[PDB]
Design a protein around this ligand. Sequence first.
Ligand SMILES: [Mg+2]
Ligand SMILES: [Mg+2]
Ligand SMILES: [Mg+2]
Ligand SMILES: [Mg+2]
Ligand SMILES: [Mg+2]
Ligand SMILES: [Mg+2]
Ligand SMILES: [Mg+2]
Ligand SMILES: [Mg+2]
Ligand SMILES: [Mg+2]
Ligand SMILES: [Mg+2]
Ligand SMILES: [Mg+2]
Ligand SMILES: [Mg+2]
Ligand SMILES: [Mg+2]
Ligand SMILES: [Mg+2]
Ligand SMILES: [Mg+2]
Ligand SMILES: [Mg+2]
Ligand SMILES: [Mg+2]
Ligand SMILES: [Mg+2]
Ligand SMILES: [Mg+2]
Ligand SMILES: [Mg+2]
Ligand SMILES: [Mg+2]
Ligand SMILES: [Mg+2]
Ligand SMILES: [Mg+2]
Lengths: 70, 154, 117
Amino acid sequence: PVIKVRENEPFDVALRRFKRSCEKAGVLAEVRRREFYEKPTTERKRAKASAVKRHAKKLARENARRTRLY
Amino acid sequence: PRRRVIGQRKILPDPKFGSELLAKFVNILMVDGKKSTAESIVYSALETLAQRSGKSELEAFEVALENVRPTVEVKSRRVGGSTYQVPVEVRPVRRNALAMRWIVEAARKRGDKSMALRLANELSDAAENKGTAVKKREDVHRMAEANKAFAHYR
Amino acid sequence: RKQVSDGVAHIHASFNNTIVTITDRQGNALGWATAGGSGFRGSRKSTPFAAQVAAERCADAVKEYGIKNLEVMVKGPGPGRESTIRALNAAGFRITNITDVTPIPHNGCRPPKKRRV
RNA sequence: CUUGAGUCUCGUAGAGGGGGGUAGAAUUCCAGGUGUAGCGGUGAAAUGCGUAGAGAUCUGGAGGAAUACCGGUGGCGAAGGCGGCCCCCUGGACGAAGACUGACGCUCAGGUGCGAAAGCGUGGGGAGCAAACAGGAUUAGAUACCCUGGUAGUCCACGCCGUAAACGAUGUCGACUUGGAGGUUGUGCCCUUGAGGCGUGGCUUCCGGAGCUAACGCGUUAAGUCGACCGCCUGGGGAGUACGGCCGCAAGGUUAAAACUCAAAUGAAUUGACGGGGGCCCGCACAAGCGGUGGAGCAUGUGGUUUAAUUCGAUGCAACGCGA
Ligand SMILES: [Mg+2]
Ligand SMILES: [Mg+2]
Ligand SMILES: [Mg+2]
Ligand SMILES: [Mg+2]
Ligand SMILES: [Mg+2]
Ligand SMILES: [Mg+2]
Ligand SMILES: [Mg+2]
Ligand SMILES: [Mg+2]
Ligand SMILES: [Mg+2]
Ligand SMILES: [Mg+2]
Ligand SMILES: [Mg+2]
Ligand SMILES: [Mg+2]
Ligand SMILES: [Mg+2]
Ligand SMILES: [Mg+2]
Ligand SMILES: [Mg+2]
Ligand SMILES: [Mg+2]
Ligand SMILES: [Mg+2]
Ligand SMILES: [Mg+2]
Ligand SMILES: [Mg+2]
Ligand SMILES: [Mg+2]
Ligand SMILES: [Mg+2]
Ligand SMILES: [Mg+2]
Ligand SMILES: [Mg+2]
């Protein structure tokens, strides 16, 4: 996440760009995940859970949440 | 409480000087619902203080308060299972109340004979900034400074 | 004794501690400071505020060198990662470039085992 | 005879397998520069490392292992499994049109092969991690969880072992039976007018009808309707154990009982209760405050002890100035 502060760019603005760049890159997330060894089985299981939850939630929202709530 | 933003209660101003702050001080001082006695003590203390230090009763009293109010106190935020002492800025009504409370406690402690005498001495000390209530405020501030790392991560 | 005007601020921001190190543009270190040496231990040195005061201390230390421009290289996942740069700017350098240099492996060495807490 | 089964032609996608090179990032170590008192770690510490100059930072070098992003309920494989890039050898699947053989097929007890990880033998290698082990914490203890270290092992070659919740807890092969939304990979036509319209194959994910099921659920990839063959079960424990056999260097694997003992053991779902589950909410529940009790004397009640009797009852909150 390289940033160079442009001419007449405020510092706060520069900081904002830097943070955005880092978030987009996903550096913190990568480091956190690589902090400890996740077993392959654990990684697979987590992936499966994420996929299932995401799919179920999407289905519930779009199709199940098409009714009169009140 | 959980579900209450109750209205602050009405305190009448003291008859001699017409001051709400002074009335509150008298109330704090009072014990056993004996208001008359408390007001007599407060007036005696004020009169002596005015004579000793200067200008008026209310101005002297204010000066003492200024030297004994705390800007910041600490609370114990208990979120991560352990308790973080966090600093927090003390709002004005609390600042006055806390300062008054500290002053009265210090006066009660003090070794002079009459209550009025103790109060006058304590107030004068506060004005100078070498007394015990002032020491208490200093201690509170010291703690806040120590725990400044936990100020805006509650 | 020397002057350089333009330095690099290497902000090593681990979870436990923040190390700030001002260096010449080549790599040679001028002054450093940590939250530990800044007077914070444990829960207090693993905070943004500690990082900020460490940064202030570092700036003071390299004041002799008269450094005016400064590019900051942030490393690691840390409570500061921002406080340090804010503090440095306040201390009054022109921040020219801000770069992240956190070392990610391309699936290399095995990490240590997961903590059971 | 050609519909099952196979052969040939042309393409397609693929972490399918075996061998050999190579790339960059990162960790470790080594040497050197800068530089100075800390670093590391945790809930908090300490062990550990550092003024014999560490950690930080730049340069160079060594070496091992693994391939970020792409990456996907994506793909390939009989399963186990397979993930940087390049080459060499190599197996299968699928589609298109035809041509060919002419039931050549399905299943399979014994048998044979393949078979994660750990483990074993011999010879290498060894960065990181890490059983064992050591020290520091925590604790009533802590032969654990946490921390700092750390050896087999993890890697390579070649042998062995032969097991896993080796799971879809679902044997293989074939036929038939309403649908919807996707993914992936072919292919025919439509002007691809654009990413696009209508088909037709393969594999694949979810939802759901009839039907089935104890229910949960399954539902054209069946747990539906059927046919062929195999494997396996017959209450819980004893016990996948003993003995015998076979196999193995060993660890052990495989085959596999009996006495004795009980009237249960189990599956799914229901209503509660409970959770050091989750969401929302209240109450002097905490918080903010004020005043007490626990120390003293005395009053009173209780326990106890004493007594001839110390009447009987109340005795966690919700008995103890209570019946009185
Ligand atoms: Mg660790
Ligand atoms: Mg391939
Ligand atoms: Mg295939
Ligand atoms: Mg057999
Ligand atoms: Mg192995
Ligand atoms: Mg070996
Ligand atoms: Mg060996
Ligand atoms: Mg280790
Ligand atoms: Mg360990
Ligand atoms: Mg088995
Ligand atoms: Mg498996
Ligand atoms: Mg089985
Ligand atoms: Mg077969
Ligand atoms: Mg279904
Ligand atoms: Mg029996
Ligand atoms: Mg046996
Ligand atoms: Mg045997
Ligand atoms: Mg309270
Ligand atoms: Mg008492
Ligand atoms: Mg007593
Ligand atoms: Mg009692
Ligand atoms: Mg009685
Ligand atoms: Mg009784």
